Amino acid sequence: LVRDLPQGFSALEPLVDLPIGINITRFQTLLALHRSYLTPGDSSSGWTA
Amino acid sequence: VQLQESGGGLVQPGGSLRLSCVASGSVTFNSMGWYRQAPGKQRELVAQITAGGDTHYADSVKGRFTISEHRGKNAVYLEMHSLKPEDTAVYYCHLQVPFLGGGYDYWGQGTQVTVSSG
Amino acid sequence: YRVVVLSFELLHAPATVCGPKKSTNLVKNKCVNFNFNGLTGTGVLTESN
Ligand SMILES: *[C@@H]1O[C@H](CO)[C@@H](O)[C@H](O)[C@H]1NC(C)=O
């Protein structure tokens, strides 16, 4: 029942280091397309709006 | 990095010994896996234990491996008995640590175990 | 001629092919000089809970 960040504190544990060694300046997020681009539905073809 | 494992003993066929993934502390998990690989063949599966209680074994290892989980020392122990020379391999412990919803097992660590009469 | 080339990657990575930095054996309950992964010093080394 929280849409935004819930109030509280939680320490972050270090999962993994990656040996890349290149510059990074811009980033992007990849989502799952639940609907169809060729024949989009009227509604609910996505995931719960 | 994080976790680690080594050890193991070289024994004659038909013996019994306890492979142990040496503990690296309390880690969140739901599935512990013992897994074996030998050169010249595809890396194969040995057995998985589940924090809930599920236990799965490979088809070729019936009646010879017993898997157990110890939550105080948080280590999985495989007791192996009635050995035949097809177990000559190196054995790895793959984790389950939830990454985005599971993944990134720590099976980097290995234990070289060869069963032989000489 | 059987030609074998070993290319070693000395990059900004957690080293994986290493170990000839042999360790001999360790001693406990006795005041010794210790070099622990670069931590140099002296002391008695005991089991910790
Ligand atoms: C990448 O970073 C290096 C600094 O190490 C800099 O010299 C170089 O110009 C950078 N290149 C780009 C494309 O950002």
Per CB-CB distance under 8 Å, the chain C contacts of A15 are none
Nearest to residue B92, comparing CAs of B105, B74, B73? B105
CB–CB of A17 and C14 under 8 A? Answer: yes
- Tell me the nearest-neighbour CA distance from A16 into chain B, angstroms: 8
Per CB-CB distance under 8 Å, the chain C contacts of A19 are 11-14
* Whether the Cβ atoms of residue B1 and residue C14 lie closer than 8 Å to each other: yes
Per CB-CB distance under 8 Å, the chain A contacts of C16 are none
Using alpha carbons, list the distances in angstroms from residue A49 to A34, B49, C8.
Answer: 11, 38, 52
Give dist(CA A1, CA B42) in Å, integer: 47
This PDB structure is determined at a resolution in Å of 3.4
CB–CB of A15 and B104 under 8 A? Answer: yes
Nearest to residue C21, comparing CAs of C33, C37, C9? C37
* Whether the Cβ atoms of residue B107 and residue B93 lie closer than 8 Å to each other: yes
SS3 for A1-49 is: CCCCCCCCCCCCCCCCCCCCCCCCCCCCCCCCCCCCCCCCCCCCCCCCC
Give dist(CA B17, CA B29) in Å, integer: 25
This entry's atomic model was obtained through cryo-EM
Contacts of B97 (CB under 8 A, 6+ apart): A15, B27, B28, B29, B103, B104, B105, B106
C-beta atoms surrounding A44 within 10 Å? 10
Residue B59's SS3 state is helix
How far does the centroid of ligand 1 lie from the alpha carbon of residue B12, in Å? 58
Give the nearest chain A residue to C14 (CA atoms).
Answer: A19
Nearest to residue C43, comparing CAs of C32, C25, C29? C32
